Design an enzyme around this catalytic site. Structure first.
Site, mmCIF file in Angstrom:
data_model
loop_
_atom_site.group_PDB
_atom_site.id
_atom_site.type_symbol
_atom_site.label_atom_id
_atom_site.label_comp_id
_atom_site.label_asym_id
_atom_site.label_seq_id
_atom_site.Cartn_x
_atom_site.Cartn_y
_atom_site.Cartn_z
ATOM 1 N N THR A 172 -6.697 -10.438 4.134
ATOM 2 C CA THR A 172 -5.341 -10.903 4.517
ATOM 3 C C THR A 172 -5.255 -12.422 4.685
ATOM 4 O O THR A 172 -4.315 -13.082 4.159
ATOM 5 C CB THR A 172 -4.909 -10.147 5.839
ATOM 6 O OG1 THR A 172 -4.929 -8.770 5.558
ATOM 7 C CG2 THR A 172 -3.425 -10.547 6.237
ATOM 8 N N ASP A 220 -0.387 0.789 13.384
ATOM 9 C CA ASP A 220 -1.564 1.371 12.746
ATOM 10 C C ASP A 220 -2.024 2.554 13.570
ATOM 11 O O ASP A 220 -1.359 2.917 14.580
ATOM 12 C CB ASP A 220 -2.678 0.298 12.644
ATOM 13 C CG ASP A 220 -3.623 0.550 11.443
ATOM 14 O OD1 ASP A 220 -4.326 1.582 11.428
ATOM 15 O OD2 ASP A 220 -3.620 -0.279 10.519
ATOM 16 N N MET A 241 1.735 6.986 10.186
ATOM 17 C CA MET A 241 2.822 6.566 9.294
ATOM 18 C C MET A 241 3.419 7.731 8.462
ATOM 19 O O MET A 241 4.547 7.627 7.968
ATOM 20 C CB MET A 241 2.350 5.429 8.373
ATOM 21 C CG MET A 241 1.387 5.918 7.259
ATOM 22 S SD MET A 241 0.624 4.514 6.418
ATOM 23 C CE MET A 241 -0.650 5.388 5.452
ATOM 24 N N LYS A 254 0.621 -3.844 3.213
ATOM 25 C CA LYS A 254 -0.395 -4.490 2.396
ATOM 26 C C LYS A 254 -1.639 -3.629 2.318
ATOM 27 O O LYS A 254 -2.138 -3.189 3.357
ATOM 28 C CB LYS A 254 -0.743 -5.853 2.987
ATOM 29 C CG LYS A 254 -1.949 -6.529 2.235
ATOM 30 C CD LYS A 254 -2.291 -7.910 2.890
ATOM 31 C CE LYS A 254 -3.557 -8.416 2.270
ATOM 32 N NZ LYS A 254 -4.775 -7.562 2.616
ATOM 33 N N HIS A 258 -2.336 1.730 -2.171
ATOM 34 C CA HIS A 258 -3.538 1.911 -3.046
ATOM 35 C C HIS A 258 -4.556 2.885 -2.418
ATOM 36 O O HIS A 258 -5.478 3.271 -3.079
ATOM 37 C CB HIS A 258 -4.191 0.582 -3.406
ATOM 38 C CG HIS A 258 -5.064 -0.014 -2.336
ATOM 39 N ND1 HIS A 258 -6.125 -0.853 -2.624
ATOM 40 C CD2 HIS A 258 -4.995 0.039 -0.981
ATOM 41 C CE1 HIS A 258 -6.682 -1.261 -1.504
ATOM 42 N NE2 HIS A 258 -6.002 -0.744 -0.501
ATOM 43 N N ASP A 259 -4.353 3.237 -1.137
ATOM 44 C CA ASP A 259 -5.224 4.275 -0.467
ATOM 45 C C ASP A 259 -4.871 5.707 -0.765
ATOM 46 O O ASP A 259 -5.636 6.640 -0.404
ATOM 47 C CB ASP A 259 -5.204 4.092 1.059
ATOM 48 C CG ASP A 259 -5.788 2.782 1.519
ATOM 49 O OD1 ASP A 259 -6.629 2.150 0.815
ATOM 50 O OD2 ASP A 259 -5.412 2.356 2.647
HETATM 51 N N1 LIG Z 1 -1.626 7.720 8.905
HETATM 52 C C1 LIG Z 1 -1.716 6.346 9.135
HETATM 53 N N2 LIG Z 1 -0.823 5.671 9.880
HETATM 54 C C2 LIG Z 1 -0.913 4.325 10.122
HETATM 55 N N3 LIG Z 1 -1.918 3.590 9.575
HETATM 56 C C3 LIG Z 1 -2.867 4.167 8.802
HETATM 57 C C4 LIG Z 1 -2.807 5.583 8.515
HETATM 58 N N4 LIG Z 1 -3.848 5.880 7.695
HETATM 59 C C5 LIG Z 1 -4.515 4.755 7.455
HETATM 60 N N5 LIG Z 1 -3.911 3.724 8.111
HETATM 61 C C6 LIG Z 1 -4.369 2.323 8.124
HETATM 62 O O1 LIG Z 1 -4.110 1.679 6.840
HETATM 63 C C7 LIG Z 1 -4.930 0.477 6.808
HETATM 64 C C8 LIG Z 1 -5.484 0.337 5.366
HETATM 65 S S1 LIG Z 1 -6.441 -1.092 5.161
HETATM 66 C C9 LIG Z 1 -5.172 -2.397 5.061
HETATM 67 C C10 LIG Z 1 -5.149 -3.147 6.392
HETATM 68 C C11 LIG Z 1 -4.120 -4.321 6.429
HETATM 69 N N6 LIG Z 1 -2.731 -3.919 6.026
HETATM 70 C C12 LIG Z 1 -4.657 -5.342 5.475
HETATM 71 O O2 LIG Z 1 -4.230 -5.417 4.310
HETATM 72 O O3 LIG Z 1 -5.519 -6.184 5.845
HETATM 73 C C13 LIG Z 1 -6.045 0.724 7.823
HETATM 74 O O4 LIG Z 1 -5.894 -0.250 8.892
HETATM 75 C C14 LIG Z 1 -5.848 2.144 8.350
HETATM 76 O O5 LIG Z 1 -6.214 2.334 9.726
#
Ligand SMILES: Nc1ncnc2c1ncn2[C@@H]1O[C@H](CSCC[C@H](N)C(=O)O)[C@@H](O)[C@H]1O
Ligand SMILES: Nc1ncnc2c1ncn2[C@@H]1O[C@H](CSCC[C@H](N)C(=O)O)[C@@H](O)[C@H]1O
Ligand SMILES: [K+]
Ligand SMILES: [K+]
Ligand SMILES: [K+]
Ligand code: NA
Ligand code: NA
Ligand code: NA
Ligand code: NA
Lengths: 352, 352
Positions: A172, A220, A241, A254, A258-259
């Site tokens: 970030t 988060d 979320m 951000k 992609h997850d």
């Molecule tokens: N169900 C959920 N609700 C909220 N956050 C979640 C989630 N599942 C995963 N995440 C969060 O999604 C993030 C993905 S990593 C990206 C972290 C940050 N936006 C950056 O770009 O630096 C992690 O912090 C993880 O804890």
């Protein structure tokens, strides 16, 4: 018969294979240089240093100088460090790309190196064959290697949670300057913004500093909010979320989408769309856009992150056509992409 | 103050770091392609294959075709594989360096890939920092990672022993043709040869085939002779080279001396010198010669093997000046180097 070679065995070709075979040595020698803090010792010194001078300033004593010399030789060949004769001594300096190993500026990449080259976090890559030949298991490689899905794993391993969160924090920090400067106009007229899955808050702290009249929220999972510094003027909210996204003028995500696979991204996007106003609401997606037609500086690492997601999160990196279909399917009106000279691009999705 | 960047953040530079950071992805995607046998499926097919056709011939069923597509995309970007549109279908072929992934010829590198990218055998590389900041322990990284020194470890882990021995067998297969053809004159007048630390016998089986009038002997530790096929006309002897080297007209040592420090190499070399005749005896050393003045196709991987030895065996790779001093100190009259377009070179050491 089969091919019979009669001449001319090509050395460059075989060396290319050896170099791919030993690709991990580049990752793990780099890790060592980071742990020894060689770049910062030198940069702080302000001039090239002898092996002896270097040794005196290393993180601990004693120092095996033969080993240090040999690692430095490899590092010079990588063209990260330099070696030269100065006033009758061999001295070690920094090459231009070593600037990313130097602390104290936004493009220092140290946190990300330490997360990505962590031994446990590398383990899932050994299960790549099993991601193709699944044998009827739908688990991720991360789960095969480390026991459970990535997010529950972080909830149960506080040191790993903190290492991962700081890697994402570093990622970030690499983009925030370009974001707030090149894309300032995106923040016009916004009174509230929620960074969904916003990690330990690097993005919101930076937006809040650049745009003092926007009330910022980081959202988060509980185990990530728990690994975050206290907040004053920035709301810190924990939750899931998939079940709730806090309403605001804008939502940013951000390295989130992609997850997740398509059906999940659509569920997340619909939830964000219904969280922003009909009148000028927007969702700001910051993720890789894969170009599969031409080559760019970050193409190789973007393809790597595609497999990284496949193995660690169950997600993927997406081409523009793939982003277009996803945003269409979530029922948005349109999108706009802004490149910011980074790994990720900015994609605004407009629900109306 | 410190450097303030005002313009022009350089993308190529940052991508070079990302590419080093993710060097292990090249190693471990390559491992997966080897385990899936993609190159041989295609080569045996004789033409580029669709994703569907490929899937039907993979090592097991079922197949996750999305994962296969994504790994192939990475492999095409490595320029090991190709993708193209043929008669209205996307089909996957081999690029020129994939020839080293194709079975059935001496330069097939599969055995070496599987040894070098093994998860346990990669583990010592995570202890590189501890090889410089020793904290008073003289153990190798291999011992730190896996419990004991490399050779006793192989004696206690038969599957690992066999994987390592086959990696070295493969390494040997890569050079034997050049050896017996370019260096035939080295075998003139020899009636007996002992390959000291000769592994599971690839080198002696090849020399014995090329020079039917030389009585060949392989000599190694008991746990390696135990992992070797039976011998008829070739003597198989087990023992400890520090205590005994079988007398012969010539002694050969391939990838031996790079395992050991100077004092040990001198002890081994003296022992070989006293094993060969005063009248035309010679010791044939096959190991890397490091050039630290100019760049060659294998330079990068030779520097890698230097650290590989530092971590796994306690040895090192040596420059010509270093080989010269070692051979001088063991009391030899002179040496001669022959390059054979391989990772290793040939160094004949003449005791008289
Ligand atoms: N169900 C959920 N609700 C909220 N956050 C979640 C989630 N599942 C995963 N995440 C969060 O999604 C993030 C993905 S990593 C990206 C972290 C940050 N936006 C950056 O770009 O630096 C992690 O912090 C993880 O804890
Ligand atoms: N004390 C000893 N006596 C004999 N062989 C030994 C030894 N210590 C190690 N070795 C052997 O040295 C070899 C190093 S690996 C090289 C193997 C073979 N010459 C090749 O190039 O393919 C191993 O097979 C190991 O078992
Ligand atoms: K590893
Ligand atoms: K933990
Ligand atoms: K075993
Ligand atoms: Na030096
Ligand atoms: Na790209
Ligand atoms: Na395809
Ligand atoms: Na060299």
């Amino acid at each position: 018969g089969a091919m019979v070679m009669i001449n001319k065995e090509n050395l460059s070709s075989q060396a290319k294979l050896w170099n791919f075979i030993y690709g991990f040595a580049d990752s793990l020698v780099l890790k060592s240089a980071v742990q020894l803090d060689l770049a910062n010792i030198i940069h702080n010194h302000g001039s090239p240093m002898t092996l002896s001078e270097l040794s005196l300033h290393l993180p601990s004593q004693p120092v095996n100088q033969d080993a240090l010399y040999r690692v430095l030789r490899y590092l010079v060949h990588m063209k990260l460090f330099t070696k030269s004769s100065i006033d009758g001594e061999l001295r070690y300096g920094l090459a231009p790309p070593a600037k990313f190993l130097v602390k104290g500026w936004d493009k220092c990449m140290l946190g990300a190196i330490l997360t990505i080259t962590d031994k446990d976090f590398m383990a899932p890559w050994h299960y790549l064959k099993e991601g193709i030949l699944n044998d009827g298991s739908t688990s991720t490689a991360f789960e095969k290697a480390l026991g459970t899905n990535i997010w529950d794993y972080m909830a149960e391993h506080p040191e790993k949670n903190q290492l991962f969160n700081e890697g994402m924090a570093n990622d970030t920090r690499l983009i925030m300057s370009a974001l707030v400067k090149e894309c300032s106009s995106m923040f016009d007229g916004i009174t509230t913004i929620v960074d969904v899955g916003g990690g330990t808050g690097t993005a919101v702290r930076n937006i809040a500093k650049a745009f003092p009249h926007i009330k910022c929220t980081v959202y988060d999972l509980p185990h990530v909010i728990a690994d975050s510094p206290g907040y004053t003027e920035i709301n810190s909210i924990q939750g899931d979320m998939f079940k709730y996204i806090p309403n605001a003028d804008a939502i940013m995500m951000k390295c989130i989408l992609h997850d997740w696979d398509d059906k999940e991204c659509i569920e997340i996007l619909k939830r964000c769309k219904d969280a922003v106003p009909r009148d000028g609401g927007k969702v700001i997606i910051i993720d890789i856009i894969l170009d599969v037609k031409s080559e760019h500086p970050y193409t190789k690492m973007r393809l790597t992150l595609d497999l990284d997601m496949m193995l660690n999160t169950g997600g993927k990196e997406r081409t523009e056509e793939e982003w277009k279909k996803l945003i269409h399917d979530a029922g948005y009106k349109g999108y706009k992409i802004t490149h910011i000279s980074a790994v990720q691009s900015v994609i605004e999705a407009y629900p109306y």
